[PDB]
């Protein structure tokens, strides 16, 4: 069972850590201005403030 | 009769005792207030209820310490200030008996927490302790009504001397002694002895009772100081009372009784320093 | 044994080959977020004991919490009003969940049973909809897939997907050796990931019931886990005071979020809506906000009198709720 | 209308506050013991599916016995969610010598756990009758070489066992340890549990009085 699990785990189309890093960068920057925590929202549009 | 040599020697001893008492009590009580304010600020829900009446005791001792220099000064030079003399006497005696009552309440609280651990573990909160402290303040200031009329309208406002024939009457003396020494002495003795007995009786419940062996000594010390601080004065008061009601007539007896009374009243202001030792310093270290 | 060693070596070598450069080496071109101001907008009071779990609603307004007094409480986060107060049969509750539709809530604990409560009843009271039994150990985490499918992780080293209406396990996820602690669904509802006290996490597909991948690297048990918002990465928090961001595609660790002055374990982790802020609650009485792309402690959420055990972010990203052992829920923005 | 929602929150708060006086007066005791310790007869003589709970009243005080019936095998801190219990009550089969070491090995794991630093230990040595039979048949020295008294005296073996259990406890300055030697009659154990819990609350009060 361990051998089969490791065999199936090894057979995954990995991408470069640089490429996945670029993907995370793209997702973070694309939704950056919709994040009420990166850019706090003024009290006029803040349900808690 | 003759009271000149007794008065001179006693004035010398009043300075000699009160000046170190004043400085040491001021320093120690300021440190104690700082430490217990530190304990309270954190709102540790174990140390708040005890810290409140430790603060109360420290405040009463601090008031007595602040009143001591006025007692030293105004008792040597005549003061054409009836209001200042009355304020000094009020501060002094109110602080002394506030310390007595706070000590008595500390002993009552310890005995209640020890003898009735379930009830006290349920119905004991910092607000009740603060209410009891406020009640102590109200009662001790209510008891100060007799001490605005020591000297009456007599212009010889030599503070802490020649009070009156009314102050030394039975109707003021007996309420002073019973509610000032005898009631707190009985309560203090009962609570402390019973707490010692209960905490020693824990050897039949667990072999870990020795953990609280120190808690024995502290409580025992609470008796020993309270006896030495306040037993000689009120007995002294009693003696002087017997002088002022024409029960004691000899001149040597009168001089000795007056000297003993004044010396005892000087020594009981060392209680403001013995309190930061019996309490305030039997806890872990009382980290400064 | 030799084949297993060869497969592990091949996986690690592929990881190294993919690891040409990490995020901390190429994110220097992004301006750091700075130092984030989060203030206690509300303080939810009413629990009588430690709070062990919370979960936000999908409307970003309702909030369920579980505490050791044997109670779930459903709060309106805007007005502090307690919408519901559900007494539990078992006072030893370790997890709670809130249905994406808002119709149901769930909880579990040392009773080995996942209790599902229906919030939409004609009688107007909360009624125990189901009591999913079948786990052997205590219940550590619980996450709804929909109104009828629920995934529960337990201390019997076994995860499970349950059909709520039937009451029996639809499928069983095995492969962990230690107590399964935390569980996070992918934001597509086809995958999930679990951390199970083996210094390892595993990714499980819901329908096939098979462990696609196993991630390692921690030194202690993993107490918390959550997905990156796009579902392509996930972050774990273990007791070695270390957060770790792993990739689904790279099959390896992407970042380590650790600092010298923090040594206590992590009780909870969460992401922001864009994913740049990784929030983590710690045993040291306060939460820390890490720049998920720089591994820098860009903020601190202090204010609890005890250990922060619960941490959740609203679906719209407006606020962050924390729960701690002092029985107070604090909403931060 | 938000007025109705606020009102409903108020009745919910009233219901929660009505149980505060119960949550504050409730004594939770975590019950541990091996399969041979006689836990079943103990609980039965207390006049009384995951873990179990048992609720009872002694002298207007509510006690809740939490019995982790085999689920304690998950020796993880997350499972160690019992740091709020007043006492841990161990049951040990004192007569069955062959397992005392094992019992001791368990005791040392529980009392020295950092989680239970604020928890007093009540220790019950069940089957004392089977002790007086076992003592006169076999020697306690046959299993423990540290014994020093005469192996055929019940009192000396009893003190040896008590000290063996007490010596597994490091940091003897936190909470008191209580030991009792009980038989299968078990007709007074509620009284002993109440006495030990009252003494633990006394210890907590003394901690709270700043006497040392
Ligand atoms: C419900 C709460 C109860 C308590 C509340 C707190 C309030 C306390 C009330 C205070 C009562 C007054 C105490 C009485 C003694 C005193 O206040 O002080 C003694 C002594 O000072 C007076 O002695 P007195 O006889 O007046 O005069 C002497 C020498 O003073 C001369 O030096 C001279 O040498 C001697 O011959 C002789 O004349």
Residue numbers in the entry:
A (entry chain G): 14 to 62
B (entry chain R): 10 to 297
C (entry chain B): 8 to 340
D (entry chain A): 8 to 55, 67 to 230
What does the paper say about this structure?
Despite the lasting debate over whether GPR55 is a cannabinoid receptor, it is known to play crucial roles in the nervous and metabolic systems. Following similar discoveries by other groups, LPI has gradually been accepted as the endogenous ligand of GPR55. We solved the structures of LPI (16:0)- and AM251-bound GPR55 in complex with G13 by single particle analysis of cryo-electron microscopy (cryo-EM) at resolutions of 2.85 Å and 3.19 Å, respectively. The structures exhibit the typical GPCR/G-protein complex conformation in which the G-protein engages with the receptor mainly through its Gα subunit.
Results showed that LPI most robustly activated GPR55 with an EC50 in the micromolar range (~0.34 µM), consistent with the previous report. LPI is well-resolved in the orthosteric pocket. The inositol head and phosphate group make extensive polar interactions with the upper part of pocket, while the acyl tail snuggles into a highly hydrophobic groove in the lower part of pocket. Specifically, N16N-term, H170ECL2 and N171ECL2 form a hydrogen-bond network with LPI’s inositol ring; M172ECL2, W1775.34, and R2536.62 form polar interactions with LPI’s phosphate group, clamping LPI in position for receptor binding. The backbone carbonyl group of F169ECL2 forms a hydrogen-bond interaction with the sn-1 hydroxyl group of the glycerol; and F1023.33, I1564.60 and Y1063.37 shape the hydrophobic tunnel for the acyl tail. The tunnel is directly connected to an opening formed by TM3, TM4 and TM5 in the middle of the bilipid plasma membrane, which serves as a lateral entry for lysolipids in the membrane, similar to what we observed in GPR3 and GPR174. Mutating these residues to alanine completely abolished the response to LPI, highlighting their essential role in LPI recognition. However, Y2887.53 of the NPxxY motif in the LPI-bound GPR55 exhibits a characteristic shift toward the center of the intracellular cavity, which is a hallmark of class A GPCR activation. In the DRY motif, in contrast to the polar interaction of R1523.50/T2646.33 that locks the lower part of TM6 in an inactive conformation in the antagonist-bound GPR34, R1193.50 of LPI-bound GPR55 forms a polar interaction with the upper residue S2316.40 of TM6. This interaction tilts TM6 open, allowing the αH5 of Gα to engage with the intracellular cavity of the receptor.
